[PDB]
Structures are given as structure tokens and as C-alpha cells.
């Protein structure tokens, strides 16, 4: 039917503002004045923060504002703060249909440095008698969300059986992620220790496990 | 006060049919235009199907034009979505949304179903204890939790004492493995000097597979 | 990450004794002033103990000295509280709090720890099944709960489906009835279209007298 | 020895300012720059806003500061929002002992007057058997918080045995209340009908129930 073009991503420090463009067709946008703007967390559903064009729903600061030019409407958000952070698609009525646009992702810099805090589980019991062991790297509360994950055994790296998932954002804009090494029971015992070396801004931390 | 409840997501194979619908209260329903939006993983929102206050007029996107039916029934007040030959990229989750004036937008929300279209069966998870080590228990915290391995699809609850437990409370994203199954761990940090008379319990729920399963974790 | 997690609070008679713990994690125990702050029902803060990161040196609110001690040990990383000759306006959540610079301020807070201080004696709760209606569900949405009866002191945790279940579940504050028990009530509400297909399980925890009760919520 | 004084209360509607001054003597609030301030939302931990007089915390808004004039320190709140809605307490450092100040409570208003959703349950079989019988009324998001109960037993009003807490505001600062008819399984078996009846500005709701 067709699209309300958004920028994909858009970023600002605390205190600024940023706005946000939709452009569609004499159709939409420029269709009618019904145009909304959503705001949504990760997780959750859809918030209604602006209708027709330029009204704010109940309880949205005057922080946010939208307008409209031709065929492009804009959402502002002034005064930035961590919690504008989140996803925003504008919505128009378009006569047969409605759209939703193709969506925003609002990211608010500052936030300081965080360190991961790495926990490392050897293999269960229950999980060494089923004839299958997990060693389990987990990685939390780190800023930027970007780390690096090295496994050792002895000494000397291991590479084979790892599978790590991608930095995701906890709560707090600060960073989890996991990582995960399947090993034989009889691996596991074939080595005195086990590692999970976790770096993140040239610096490295590093736990280590041991069949015991 | 204002609420939409649905029900009626889950895993169905290529061809399928499933029925959503959305139970509402707090407001005048058969008064209120109502749509179905869904949300593919990672990705946008979109708007699927409208019915308006009455009934019988019905809009549908066309990437469902064919395949889906939106209804209602103002005297039950619930939303109906009925969606047959399903396809993988119909999987997202989905919401119903409310809207008084038309044109308006839509300000009532419900908590949204997931719907997975795969040719992958379900598969619950197994459950693991991840016992707290008796080493960083000279000092005064100590780490426990759960693995949860090898389940698809899409999601695992993890709850601990029932519950009541929700301080320290820890649970992981989920990683994707090369076999297509999931695997997650939740972690609680508690006071090493409870780890003798406090007894912690994970509490695993997978609906796909219809999977709850408590586990008690203890030291080792 | 940087977390503070304390036990041993309680109800206890006027004259006894308490001790409460924290353990810290996160962060450089050993380096950071520690207090406890207590909080009487509805009342404000009140600082009570310091003890600065060294350990020996301690600062008390004159309204707890000669009666309680903090300490500390810094290879535990763990601060105490021992709380002797207890009166009724000890009453309070006591919260655990840290700060790395003395004269900065505090901003590690543990979760609080509840101690009641009373001619007691605790009181474990009746719970009752809410039944939905068969009146109420014509319409989309059904009213279920738990009533959770003559408790005390405070407080009960409620849950849904041992933790399971969130959306559409409101428990509300308690009632101090003339008896000087205390007694509450959960409600869900849900499709009533889940109620022959959908278990409900009210999962209540009162700690003070070691009650969990699981009671499953049925139409009648 | 020493008390730092606070207002009691404040409010404020959407957009606007309110300062909250804390008086306390040369020995403390004059007699060191170690003021802080604390909000506090019901059930949760003090979270420490400024510091030092005039520094705020990692991600607290600009629309957050704090001032001194000599024995007086004020925090100033700007664009007052929903979220702001909680307690604050100053703090100083005096001497050989700190001392948290009397705590002010922050209104914010406006928000949309909201009529209660109220849900009334009968005794249960369970507590019948038990030869108890409880009349349950639950009343939930109003605004503003204040609403009254009546009860009734067929035609006509029942003043004995009710328990009625005191409304609280919900998460979102819309309150909830509950009211308890206690009765003896024969005088709930002795009427067609019991109602719960609960007014909030001038309108009435209804609800009631009976034995089968």
C-alpha cells in the first residue's frame, strides 16, 4: 500500500533534543491530519504519545511534540533523558488502511563505563550423568555493549562447542550476554581447569572452573 | 482498569490456522474501532486487519488479504482474529488495539500472543542447577541458578521460590544454537550465610510444551 | 552489579535481641563508609549506625546507643547490625546503605529488611479461593482471586501460577481489622473463554510464621 | 542535635516548579557543603539525587537542582512531571553523627479524575464451611482518593462488621481501596441479596451478590 519513511536510528546526549521524520504520500502524511506517534520499550507494546499531528496523550511531557510540513511529519523530543530511549513509529490514516512507519531507534549516549560482572558455572551433576556438560560464561551490567569472549582449558585455547549470544540491554541500558561451552563428560574431567576470559575495552577478566 | 486480554497464540506449521482473540473490559467496546498490529522479531510494527464499532466492515493489509478474518461480537465484547494458511513470515507477536474516533489512533493496548509458523516441533526444556560455588562463599555473596537448555520455541519464563524471590533475580536472553533449539540461564546472588537454612527454588515455564518444572537448587 | 543484600529482620517481643546482616558485592567493600538507615511505618528516614571502611571507628544515633552495634569484616565483606533491648517504635524496614567518600552521601542501598517489634505473636493466614462468576462472565472478562485472611504482622507476597502469571493481576494493601490482624485479597482478571481450559493457582507467602500455600482458584 | 526542617508537603501541576527549602542549623546544613538529597518512591530504597549541595547523580535531569543560603538548603524541581510524584529528604553530615531531614511529600496533579472499577465476591464454600463468611469489595483506580462505602443486605443498610482501608495510590497514582462485610454463614443465608455500594464525587456504583 506503502511505507512512512523514518531515519533507522537516530542519537543524543542528555539534555538535547533530536527529532524524528516521517515522510509519506499526499495520501497520509499529507492525507490528513492522523497522524500519531508510538513510543515503544523493548518487551512491551506500543504507547500513544502524539495524535492528530500534535496533540500530546495524557500524561506526556511537553518534552514532546510533534508537526507536520507537506508530507512529512516530526516528532521532537527535547531535554533527552535515559528513559526516551526506545523505539518510536509514527502511524497515519490512509483512507483504505492504516500504516505504521518503519520505526526509530532513539538512543541517549553519556551513561559511564560499566565493567562486566562474569559468573562462570561449570557442569552440573544431573547434567554430567545424562552424558552432556555445559559450562556457562554469563556477562552483565557492561557499557558499551561490545565484549569479547575467550575459552581455555589447561593452558591453551578451545574454539570447538562455543556458542555466544549478542550484547542485549538489561533493565538499565546497561548490557548482558552469555556464553555457552559444550564439552563431553570426558573432557571435562580430562582437564584440571576450565576459563572464560571476557574482554571489553582492553581490558580482560577472567573466571575459571575445574572438574574438582 | 482500561484492559484488553488476549489468548489464542502459538506454534503451528506451514499451512496452519490459528484463532486469536482478545477479551476487553473497562470501557464501552461496541463503541471502539478495533485493529490486530504485529511485531516480526527485531522488527516493526504493522497494522493487519480493522474492524469498526459495529461489525461487518472489516480493512485488511494485504499481506494477509485472503487468509485472515477479523470479527467481533459487542455483546461478548471480544475481538476475534481467524488466520489460516499461515506462513513463517506471519510470525510475530500479535496486538489488539483500541481506538474510540476513528482516525484518532489507538490507546488501548493489549499485552500482545505470540505466533510462531515453523516447520520445527516444540521441544521443552531440561533444567539444570547451577549450584553455588563453595569458594567465593569465604566471602559474603554467592551466586546460584538454573540452566535451561534446548527448547524451542520461544519463550521461557523463570520465576524462583514461587515468586516471592525477585531480589538479586537474574534472568539471561536466550542463545540460539546451531540445532535451532534455545538455550537460557537465570541467576539469583543471595547472601552466602543463607545458603543453610534458605531453600531456592526455579520455577520453568515453557506453554509451548506445556513445561513447569520446579527445580531446587542447593549447594554442591 | 554493585549490590548490597541483608537479612535478619523479624518480629520479635519488646526486650529482645535481632542481628542484621548485609552482604555487599559489586563493588570495594573495604573502602566505603557503611550505615543503616531505618524507616518506621509511614514515618521518615532516620540514620541510627555508621562505621567507617577502616572498621572499629562507629558513629550511633543517640536513640539506639548502648543498645545496638555495627560491625564489620572486610575479608566477608559484611556489615552487621546486633539490635539488643528492642522497644515498639524500634519498628521499621532497616536498610543497609554505602558510601565510598565520607560527606558524599549514600547511594548503595540494600533492599530493606523488615523488623517488627511487638507483643507479636505471628499469626499465619487463611487463604480463600476468589471463584469467578457465572453471572459476570456473559462478557468477555472474569474476576478471580485470593483472600488472604487474619495474618500477622506484615507483610504477605501474593503471586500468580508460582510466577508465571503477571498481566491483569492487582493485590492490593492490606486491612488492619479491629483484632489487630491483618488480612488482604489478590484478584486476576482474565478471559473468562480460559476459564475450563486455564489452571489459577494463588501462590501466598507469609515468612514471619513460614506459611506457602498454593491454592488453585475453580469456578464453582 | 538536630532535626533539619522540611515542608511537609508540596504540589505542583504538569510543567511547573517547586522548590523545598531544609533548614537546619550552622552545624550542619551551614556548617559543611555535604547536603544531599533523596527521593524515594513508596516501597523502594532512597535514591540519592544531589550531592555535595549541587551535584546530581549519574542520570538524574538537569530539571533536578540544589542551592544553599546559609542554614537553608533548597532542591528546585523544573518541568515537574508524573514520575517526580514521591518523597524527598535532604541530608547533611553533622559533625559525629548525619542526620536525614523531616521528609517532604510531592504531589503532582492535574491527571484525569477516573471513576473506580469496584468487584465484589461472596463468601467462599471454603470459609462457609469454616463457619466464617467474608463479603469482599475491591475498588480500583480512581482518582482523586477519597470514596465511601455502603453497604446493604436486601432492601436495606448493614453498618456492622465492615472493614474499609484507606485508599493508596496504585503504581500509576491512581488509588486502590478494598472493604470486608464480615457476616455469619445463617445471616448471609438469611437475605435474597448483599450490595456493595461505593460513591466517588457524587456518583454512585453498585455491585451485588447472593447465596444461590
Known amino acids: 500500500q506503502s511505507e512512512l519513511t523514518q531515519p533507522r536510528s537516530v542519537s543524543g546526549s542528555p539534555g538535547q533534543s533530536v527529532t524524528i521524520s516521517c515522510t509519506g504520500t499526499s495520501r497520509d502524511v499529507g492525507g490528513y491530519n492522523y497522524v500519531s506517534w508510538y513510543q515503544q520499550h523493548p518487551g512491551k507494546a506500543p504507547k500513544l504519545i502524539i495524535h492528530?499531528?500534535?496533540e500530546r496523550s495524557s500524561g506526556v511531557p511537553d518534552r514532546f511534540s510533534g508537526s507536520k510540513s507537506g508530507n512529512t511529519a516530526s516528532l521532537t523530543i527535547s531535554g533527552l533523558q535515559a528513559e526516551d530511549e526506545a523505539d518510536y513509529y509514527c502511524w497515519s490514516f490512509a483512507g483504505s488502511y492504516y500504516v505504521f512507519g518503519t520505526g526509530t531507534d532513539v538512543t541517549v549516549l553519556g551513561q559511564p563505563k560499566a565493567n562486566p560482572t562474569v559468573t562462570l558455572f561449570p557442569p552440573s551433576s544431573e547434567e554430567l550423568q545424562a552424558n552432556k556438560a555445559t559450562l556457562v560464561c554469563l556477562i552483565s551490567d557492561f557499557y558499551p555493549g561490545a565484549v569479547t569472549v575467550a575459552w581455555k582449558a589447561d593452558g591453551s585455547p578451545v574454539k570447538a562447542g562455543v556458542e555466544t549470544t549478542k550484547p542485549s540491554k538489561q533493565s538499565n541500558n546497561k548490557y548482558a550476554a552469555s556464553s555457552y561451552l559444550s564439552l563431553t563428560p570426558e573432557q571435562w574431567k580430562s582437564h584440571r581447569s576450565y576459563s572464560c576470559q571476557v574482554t571489553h575495552e582492553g581490558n580482560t577478566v577472567e573466571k575459571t572452573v575445574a572438574p574438582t | 482498569e482500561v484492559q484488553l486480554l488476549e489468548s489464542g497464540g502459538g506454534l503451528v506449521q506451514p499451512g496452519g490456522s490459528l484463532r486469536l482473540s482478545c477479551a476487553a473490559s473497562?470501557?464501552?467496546?461496541?463503541?471502539?474501532?478495533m485493529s490486530w498490529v504485529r511485531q516480526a522479531p527485531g522488527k516493526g510494527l504493522e497494522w493487519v486487519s480493522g474492524?469498526?464499532?459495529?461489525?461487518?466492515?472489516?480493512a485488511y493489509a494485504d499481506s494477509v488479504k485472503g487468509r485472515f478474518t477479523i470479527s467481533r461480537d459487542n455483546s461478548k465484547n471480544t475481538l476475534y482474529l481467524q488466520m489460516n494458511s499461515l506462513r513463517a513470515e506471519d510470525t510475530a507477536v500479535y496486538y489488539c488495539?483500541?481506538?474510540?474516533?476513528?482516525?484518532?489512533?489507538?490507546?488501548?493496548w493489549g499485552q500482545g500472543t505470540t505466533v510462531t509458523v515453523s516447520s520445527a516441533s516444540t521441544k521443552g526444556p531440561s533444567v539444570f542447577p547451577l549450584a553455588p560455588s563453595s569458594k567465593s562463599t569465604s566471602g559474603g555473596t554467592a551466586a546460584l541458578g538454573c540452566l535451561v537448555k534446548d527448547y524451542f520455541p520461544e519463550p521461557v519464563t523463570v520465576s524462583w521460590n514461587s515468586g516471592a524471590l525477585t531480589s538479586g533475580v537474574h534472568t539471561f536472553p536466550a542463545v540460539l544454537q546451531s540445532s535451532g533449539l534455545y538455550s537460557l540461564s537465570s541467576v539469583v546472588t543471595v547472601p552466602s550465610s543463607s545458603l543453610g537454612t534458605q531453600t531456592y527454588i526455579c520455577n520453568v515455564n515453557h506453554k509451548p510444551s506445556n513445561t513447569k518444572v520446579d527445580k531446587k537448587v542447593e549447594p554442591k | 552489579e554493585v549490590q548490597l543484600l541483608e537479612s535478619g529482620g523479624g518480629l520479635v517481643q519488646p526486650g529482645g535481641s535481632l542481628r542484621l546482616s548485609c552482604?555487599?558485592?559489586?563493588?570495594?567493600?573495604?573502602?566505603?563508609?557503611?550505615?543503616?538507615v531505618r524507616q518506621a511505618p509511614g514515618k521518615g528516614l532516620e540514620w541510627?549506625?555508621?562505621?567507617?571502611?577502616?572498621?572499629?571507628?562507629?558513629?550511633?544515633?543517640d536513640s539506639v546507643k548502648g543498645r545496638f552495634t555495627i560491625s564489620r569484616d572486610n575479608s566477608k565483606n559484611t556489615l552487621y547490625l546486633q539490635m539488643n533491648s528492642l522497644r515498639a517504635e524500634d519498628t521499621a524496614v532497616?536498610?543497609?546503605?554505602?558510601?565510598?567518600?565520607?560527606?558524599?552521601?549514600?547511594?548503595?542501598?540494600?533492599?530493606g529488611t523488615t523488623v517488627t517489634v511487638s507483643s507479636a505473636s505471628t499469626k499465619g493466614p487463611s487463604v480463600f479461593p476468589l471463584a469467578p462468576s457465572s453471572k459476570s462472565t456473559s462478557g468477555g472478562t472474569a474476576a478471580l482471586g485470593c483472600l488472604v485472611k487474619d495474618y500477622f504482622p506484615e507483610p504477605v507476597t501474593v503471586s500468580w501460577n508460582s510466577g508465571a502469571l503477571t498481566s491483569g493481576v492487582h493485590t492490593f494493601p492490606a486491612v488492619l481489622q479491629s483484632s489487630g490482624l491483618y488480612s488482604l485479597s489478590s484478584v486476576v482478571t482474565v478471559p473468562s473463554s480460559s476459564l475450563g481450559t486455564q489452571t489459577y493457582i494463588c501462590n501466598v507467602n507469609h515468612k514471619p510464621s513460614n506459611t506457602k500455600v498454593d491454592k488453585k482458584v475453580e469456578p464453582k | 542535635q538536630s532535626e533539619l526542617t522540611q515542608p511537609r508537603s508540596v504540589s505542583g501541576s504538569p510543567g511547573q516548579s517547586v522548590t523545598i527549602s531544609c533548614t537546619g542549623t550552622s552545624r550542619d546544613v551551614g556548617g559543611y557543603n555535604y547536603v544531599s538529597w533523596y527521593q524515594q518512591h513508596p516501597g523502594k530504597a532512597p535514591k540519592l539525587?544531589?550531592?555535595?549541595?549541587?551535584?546530581?547523580?549519574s542520570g538524574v535531569p538537569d530539571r533536578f537542582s540544589g542551592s544553599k543560603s546559609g542554614n537553608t538548603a533548597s532542591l528546585t524541581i523544573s518541568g515537574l512531571q508524573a514520575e517526580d510524584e514521591a518523597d524527598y529528604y535532604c541530608w547533611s553530615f553533622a559533625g559525629s553523627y548525619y542526620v536525614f531531614g523531616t521528609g517532604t511529600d510531592v504531589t503532582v496533579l492535574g491527571q484525569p479524575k477516573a471513576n473506580p472499577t469496584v468487584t465484589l465476591f461472596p463468601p467462599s464454600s471454603e470459609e462457609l464451611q469454616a463457619n466464617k463468611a467474608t463479603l469482599v469489595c475491591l475498588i480500583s483506580d480512581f482518582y482523586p482518593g477519597a470514596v465511601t462505602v455502603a453497604w446493604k443486605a436486601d432492601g436495606s443498610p448493614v453498618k456492622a462488621g465492615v472493614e474499609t482501608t484507606k485508599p493508596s495510590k496504585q503504581s500509576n497514582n491512581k488509588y486502590a481501596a478494598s472493604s470486608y462485610l464480615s457476616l455469619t454463614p445463617e445471616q448471609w443465608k438469611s437475605h435474597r441479596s448483599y450490595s456493595c455500594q461505593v460513591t466517588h464525587e457524587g456518583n454512585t456504583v453498585e455491585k451485588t451478590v447472593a447465596p444461590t
Open positions: 474492524i469498526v464499532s459495529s461489525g461487518g466492515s472489516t
Open positions: 488495539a483500541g481506538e474510540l474516533l476513528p482516525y484518532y489512533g489507538m490507546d488501548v
Open positions: 473497562g470501557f464501552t467496546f461496541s463503541t471502539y474501532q
Open positions: 492528530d499531528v500534535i
